[model samples]
Target chain A: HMVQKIGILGAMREQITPILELFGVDFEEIPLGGNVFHKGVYHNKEIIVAYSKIGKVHSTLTTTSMILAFGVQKVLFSGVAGSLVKDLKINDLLVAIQLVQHDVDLSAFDHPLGFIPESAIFIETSESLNALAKEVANEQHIVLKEGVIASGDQFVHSKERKEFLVSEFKASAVEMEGASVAFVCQKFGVPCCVLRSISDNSFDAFLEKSAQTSAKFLKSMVDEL
Target chain B: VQKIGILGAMREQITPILELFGVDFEEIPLGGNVFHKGVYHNKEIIVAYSKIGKVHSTLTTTSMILAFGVQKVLFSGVAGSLVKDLKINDLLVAIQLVQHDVDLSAFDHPLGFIPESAIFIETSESLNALAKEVANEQHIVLKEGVIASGDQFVHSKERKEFLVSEFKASAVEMEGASVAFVCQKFGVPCCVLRSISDNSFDAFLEKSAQTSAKFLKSMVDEL
Candidate 1:
């Protein structure tokens, strides 16, 4: 069996700061394609992490570089999202079963709404990774739910928009980068999963606390792997 | 004096405009961005193909503004007409450009408001007027209206109606809003001129490019 070399992605520095500190012993930051990739190890597993910046374009660029430049076998994206569901509260976690771009409209291609051209309408996360994430959540005592995650460039805040997304796509959470990350990963045939910690019900919260919690959960997941 | 920067989204749209210049352009490559610098119509101009889509358009516009120090940008391309009055091969100068695909209203921002700038992107009125004058001089019929943009190539009736009804957009394409967005952010005056290539579906890339490039050549002469 081949050992998995994983690439971890976060949109902001805060989301990956704790993971960066976990290196503790040997880690080096390498700059590639206008972004930095930190190469390090946790529990004897090889990992490379990067802050992809915010929005769909930046996320796609970084995700592509992580695969083509860094040669990462699997990708794990950890970040924060605004909750759409009543049950999903701040600091709660979501493991995306599938990701969709709520802003995409390629209905001209006969694709349903939210479908990317020449791609699936709903990009699925790795089932095995989802199972592992659930187990890790159990060990960390973090409440984790699995559901559809929608992404777009805008930081959604309107009540009407929130209702539309939840009602139309059945998305439980919304963010800026997850679907694009999932889209790129799918294109490259990568096994990827997105883990998001809810920062606020409204779209206006700093990512620091959710980042820390998500990073801790990710550390646990990485250690078990 | 800063030179004018002209951008096109594909080879067909750009090749004809470059041919009209009739001089070997100096190709400057920087960080995945390649610029063709040359003089057109006795005016210093930099030309580049933005490839396709909003992301590529944004990067290209940024490079032109930052790297080339262009004072103004003029984007010429082909688009799909959403309104029946605008037929294929007719030109449209954008008064406003909106990202039809940007829906951040869930975050307290209006639809199509780019977060970085917190405003809806609009084309320069002075530049649009200049384009209109050139069109009138050349005996071309040009319409001025809102142009909507997204990453997808619009070919469905549903998508066309959605853009028309929701945005009140006259034309639709993949790059215009992004170009407008970046220009707005930089405070650079920009104008977009698009020739309709299709009626929501069934694109005619070659014909559209030819007509758009022809009008662009006339406009370049005036500049």
Candidate 2:
């Protein structure tokens, strides 16, 4: 009973709905400060689900409210990302080794590209939870890769930007909300795990099943945590 | 008229506003920001120092919208000038806003485009119109242009020229677009005002903060 409660977050309802299905639909949907929070339980561990809309700032506020309002011990984030590596196929799961904001360019002040003043160039994920993901993937026979992720407000679809993300931050994947969520969790001293299902074409096809892919991974790791 | 939410980037920027317009205020501390609820020239407003970034301003703005139920938002702060003509203490009313740091060009969209949303968030037409009217009435010369926002403060000369050349931005600040982004999503009208402060005597910090605050006070009174 080391970890009694977990907060599961995504950017859209579809990404969150599939996870709540694991625990039956008997949970309460409570609205607070303009966003809704889903209270559900799976295997006696309380789970709170929130759709953080999109953008780094929006997700930051949503994560803040979840931690302060629900008293969650750890945060688990699941969302879709564009793979930066050539071999990372669609529907593949990538657990973050670390995260950075590729757009936080303070280079004018001699700070590196991802460096924010008074903040780290790279924000580390929870090692214990990251190890849990590797363990869960090994036992479950799922294909999982771990590497650095670049998060920003832009929707990266071009070869140039993808190459830039890979070169600048050495990121294997890119998304909109991971780094901010990790940043917020670090502030509150909450153990955080970020899971991204690689997506490129066919938005729903990727979202429908990989939606379950990350969700199931989140569900699998809960008992062990 | 609806309750207005006013925001500045720093404590110095907000104090002059509170002193200029605040009639009855009580501190309501929440999160890292301190929101002041008060009657300003008989106008209801929730004002705060948004802590100087897109993320912080968005949090403060969302709180004002959800907690205080502000129907309109007015953001006034000091920023570096991208144009040579805009000198210290001169004012600029944002006709539109974009995040200079936003580069969604990867999606074949223009710079500053947020996916599935918009590139340029236009200020409320009526609010901009009112700003022009108030500037004329107060004998304040207010220039209008796209005020760009980003987390990083632009100090490099090359970056300044690049901002104006790429985005046609007239001035660069840290929070206007994010505040406008939240207001637009909530269907709330927002107007952004800025005073050029990159290049204080009368201490630039105090004079520039009061420059916009003075204009904002008049605008609020007219509203």
Candidate 3:
């Protein structure tokens, strides 16, 4: 049987429930260790959804567990992010073309090329999957922007951080959970894509208001899919 | 109180130590790694035979530190030496370990020949001192040096030299550096102690099997 699963990860369960409700998708929620909220079997697809608990390890564990439990053929990581680039307005949608762990630096062991042994900092997105997303966006008449998404455990709130990530990783957007999802999905041989709405700028303003609009955008995006 | 734990890849490396401790152990599975736990000489010692490679070691060690609350971790295994000075059955405690496989050349991240910090962890100083003191007390000859950890096995001399000259590594092992890094993250101390079972210049297959058993037994005693 060919089954496709669409997984959504966010910071809060309430943030993702609107999309699930809009899809009319019934899901089974799995609470991970009291820190993460997860849901599976959305719209008859084995989608495991969760809110990433704000770090590299948090996302890594959630993504790996989702792959194992759902046996998902494809995954979609949907969440909100901060804009690193100018002209990317609040509540705008960005598709991740690549995810870089900008914080992973291993210079000491003397290997010096960067990252710790066997760990990858940047993982490229699946081209075929990205194309599918583009088709979906075009069909819906949604303004979908595609660019590099830089991920780390830390939330970049300062302007200095925004510039650092933009300059260092050539990142257009900054999010928390996408790179770890890409890392695990790539290893699990599952096609995964990250879709995010810009909820805040690097300056961290109007988060409560922006989050509401971002949630609305996600709801529409999921319904169209 | 200093809580020290030892880890290995095979049963033979750990069984003798368990026998010496005379403690009954319970085996538990977490993710893809297997762990055994019990107390050794009144100090809690949680042990595991973490599967091979960097991810396996990193994930397992991270869980152990968080789950068992280990104050310090001692990872012991068998390794292949790139330099002629390292012989089979010779012991080496990692002064530092490099992940030779991690490449971020395309990104503008910080790249260098030394670790981002000195010794990766400040706690390694005390732990290494303890290990040295114990090694001397046990009359075991141990070398203090750096280990290069990568996914690929260095069978050719050229590859060995590349690791040594480029990475500036003294020995090559599979799981040490990643384990060290994971421990560092959790604020727990980590050190790697390995016994040389094969030299890169020699016949790897036969020498590895032959020296591994004795090396495992010696490691049990050393721990």
Candidate 4:
């Protein structure tokens, strides 16, 4: 009999390790020596993973390299995000239903074609994975809100900024690394999902408070997985 | 009425000169050809922003001439230091442009020769003299020399030495020879004027912007 191996990605090494420890999941650390290959896992079923650094370019490079290097069939991203919709309270677990890049401008060059150069808007999240997230959230009794997450290299830190995102990009949440991961995954025909916990509300206090609570929630979610 | 043209890369140095000449300009909307075509003081001047690569700039130069029917062309902008004594913002007029992008190690062409037509285009002697006179009158010191065009952005000192030894390029840019090629095919008079915007080690960012502006304004005014 073989044990199913699942990989984890988080901001800090401390954040993911404790969860694996609590769940009694045996794992080995894959070293990269430099910031390039931050983390990796060689597990059963040909499933491999890596933690991408924050921002568009770094995350995009990381995700693309991981897919090429590990031949990963599926990529599951675990991270934190800034909440945009008021209903999604702090520490609430959120699943990305769709994703869009909020910062590409094609209009300034007098392109007669309307905005959104790429026809494909709102990359669809995998239905099977979405169901798994819902089942897990229901059993855990954690409020799980699913909606579009806007991805960019910049961090939004104001309520007005959040409102702008909602109005302009039609985004419900903001994160740094998801769209890059999605882009690489989509390119290589790999199924990918980003499971994030809401850690902030674009407020200073909310950011600080959510940071602490979200870290704990992330660990527990890993344990449950 | 002959429509003259100017070709180069980078934007900051030429904006002020274009403004000074009171030239009305609009960016060429086409992505493949980074062009700005409009009348400068009622005289039509088509400008192409070919970017910082040899292939990219060469393609743009060819397209601009074919599309615009430019009769007489001028290449103006900034370049990095190749000669030890050249100072920042000192202008260099390209008497000849060399295509340094071509490597013939795997082919039968001469070491520095391009596979296409011969890589040298002699600027119109009459136009060169006129531009020199204008530069003297305006108190802008312009030197006559060969400018080299290649695909690499020169940031490292070691690369600079290698380029100097291999290509004999007095001034370095990405598009001059490509522009020369088109002008040659059409029998148009073409010349390149460059304001030295950077030394081997340091670049004059703001001056490059101002110098481009100054060069364009002066050239348009002379025309």
Candidate 5:
């Protein structure tokens, strides 16, 4: 088996705390493009973990920098999201089978909704990694669901908006960063997975707790790998 | 006197104006941004191609304002028409710019509204009027209205209608709103001029480029 130099990205500092604490030794901070990336390792795996701030642009910039500057062969994105489907509950794990930007509308370019010009309508995550994630979830007895993850620069809270996403994209969860990370990963031909925990059913709740839980789950998975 | 900053998404949009002025330019590379400083029409100007998309636009505009010390910013580019009245080759001077792709309503804010800021990002009224005057002098018909910015090239009827109905936007492009946002943050006056290159999903890249080049020449000459 080939060892992959992985990049673990979180959308905010809170989501990356567990990984940072776990990989406490020999960590170096490399600043690029107004963001600082921490390079280190965990449990015999070479990894670089960084918070991509928030939003699609920030995530894209951070992901690109990680791949280009840090030379990460694979990427794993862990964050928190509002549940779009009824089955997903707070703290439930969701692995992205595919990602789409709900806010993207390039239909004027004769492409489908959410279709990136010169790109695809849906950015697919890594099949092998996703399978591994499912296996890990089964072994750990974690509640994991694999489905479509919709991303936008917006936080989805209203019932109308939640229903809109569910009907429009059949999304299981909604977040701000996944699709853009998936977009950059696909462009570079890097295997990637977007894992999220259902932080809130409504837009009113704070996501810090659920995100931290997901991050810890992500750290455990990476450590085992 | 404060220098004027001119930005374009591609070289095709600004090269003609630079050639028309026939001025020598100094290339200044700052980080990822490359700015061309020159004098045109007796006005000190720095021009740069900010590339495409909102992030690129935001970074480039910030660099021009901070690194080049430009006082006023003007952006020239091509956009796709969202409304029926604005046809291909039509000129638009943005009165307001909105990011249709931004959604923070979950954070107790309006959709497309920048956090801790005004709901809509406005173009500099005085600069917009100047652009209108330039258009008039050149006998060009110009429309003033809202422009929508996003990362993706709009290609769907659903998105076109959403932007028009939701934001009342007349045109859709990739960079204008971010430029307006950055300028607003720095209290710098900014104006955006866009030539319609497509209507909905149909594209006329070549025609738009030529039209943008011609309109830009007229606008720059009057600057």
Candidate 6:
């Protein structure tokens, strides 16, 4: 399917600012309702990109503005993740097949964990897009893995906490910005998926390379598509 | 230079502000919510009480942004402490706010996740930053973090701990998040400032009332 305009987001400007280099023509920042979106043309496709402020609230406003204000047909998010499962290690790649917000708990009304009233517990990524990521991995010879990734607003630092997240959502990694983007896209019928690069397992030892790795993969994916 | 929207969840939060400031208000009742007009800091403002809970608070805030044309909004109210250290009159500036009881799981969304928005909503950074500087200038002791909102009063030990652990919230109240939600939707800057109240049989009426009015007035002075 040929896309007209695509939107890209990252949790910080350092991560997204590099992607602007991939633009066939150089881009510039545009503001909409107090949020910023970088605009350009990627080959034949129009592009609007941004670095959303950390956490769900900031991501939601940025994503909603993209859909309603810029009319982006699809969204791509790339960012750092802390590995939650043994199979996902530092510097490894993860394409989010499933997304969940581990912090949601409506169990008081007899609902499941991660449940929000009139909402959901687990949200899936765009199937065709997930497949495209796998194709990109094989082409680039990158050892990319796919699994459930959890999103919450906190920087998890406890072993008990890491174990608890795994037990609840079976997530391969955890981060702060993805699921909210996934949810917002799903609501507006815009296709979206997240690409994660593991920075640390629980990060008593965080390395910054993973941030650049995901950004690189995202840029390469854009060049290919 | 701006017309700020001032909202409260109860009579106590709004009535005292009007009295202490000597600002006479011409009250206008709209639906179940009441909207009042006055000039504070010689700037136009519309003050209203939307009662309690998200549904009512949403209606009033939507009116403030759409009907009243207020440039920014300030929601001043009282909430019960979710953490151990908080006591009566300790202020909480809600940098992030959420509706903890929202459960929409059948479709795969998470708890407190609003359909079109997010589980958590952030109040205006500009407003919160100014509040911090003003608090220090006035020697007003306060804390900032997530303030959870719901229709139900959190009295059970079970629910209180859940808010602290899951949301990492500072206090529990019925109104703040929805007001912030509307403000964000309309691109209006807003702040939700609450004074902590006693969770026991000892609910302090005058202390919370006077405390909220004074702090809210301080914020209005800056805006």
Q: Give me the overall lDDT of model 4.
A: 0.60
- Note the DockQ of each predicted structure: 0.16, 0.28, 0.06, 0.02, 0.21, 0.06
Docking class of 6: incorrect
* Residue A29 lDDT, candidate 4, scale 0-100: 48
Selected candidate, larger lDDT, 5 vs 6: 5
On the 0 to 100 scale, the lDDT of residue B9 in model 6 is 72
lDDT tens digits, residue span A1-225, model 6: 225888889875667655666454678778764567888876767888888775665576677677766778889988788888777777787899888878654455676777654457787779988888888889989998988988875667678979998888888888877887887687667889788778764342243455556666777777776
Error of 2 at B160 (Å): 5.3
Best by lDDT: 2
Give the per-residue lDDT digits (tens) of candidate 4, residues B1-223: 6587776566554455456556567776442345666776567777766554433344455455555667777766678778877877788888887756444343355544533246466777867887888788778888878887653455667757766787677777666765665566556787777777667423566656565556556665777
Docking class of 4: incorrect
lDDT, residue A38, model 5: 80
lDDT of 2 by residue, A137-191 (tens): 9998988899999988878778898888887788999988999888878866899
Total backbone collisions, model 4: 9
Residue B102, model 4: lDDT of 48
Q: Assign candidate 1 its CAPRI class.
A: incorrect
The full ranking of all candidates by TM-score, starting with the best, is 2, 5, 1, 6, 3, 4
Q: Give TM per candidate.
A: 0.63, 0.79, 0.54, 0.46, 0.66, 0.60
| Residue-wise C-alpha lDDT for candidate 5, range A1-225, written one tens digit per residue | 125678989876776666777556577887765568887765656788888776765676677677776778889988777788778887788899998878766565576777644456578999988988888888878788989998887777778978888888888888888987887777668899988877765433456566656766776667667
Q: Which parts of model 6 are misplaced by more than 4 Å?
A: A1-3, A202-208, B1-171, B174-223
Superposition error at A151 for model 5 (Å): 1.5
Model 4 alpha-carbon miss at residue A107, Å: 29
Provide a comma-separated list of chain B TM-scores, one per candidate: 0.89, 0.92, 0.81, 0.82, 0.90, 0.92
Report the Cα lDDT for residue A41, model 3: 52
Fnat, model 6, is 0.00
Tell me the TM-score of candidate 4's A chain.
Answer: 0.75
Collision pairs in model 2: B200-B203, B200-B204
Q: Candidate 4, clashing residue pairs?
A: B12-B209, B13-B208, B13-B209, B13-B212, B13-B213, B14-B212, B14-B213, B17-B213, B17-B214
Q: Write model 2 residue lDDT over B1-223, tens digit each, in one string.
A: 3688888876787778888874768999765568998875555789998775676677678778767889888888777888779887788889888888777565577877755567788889999999999989988898888888987768888978888888889899888988887787668999988888765144777777767788888878878
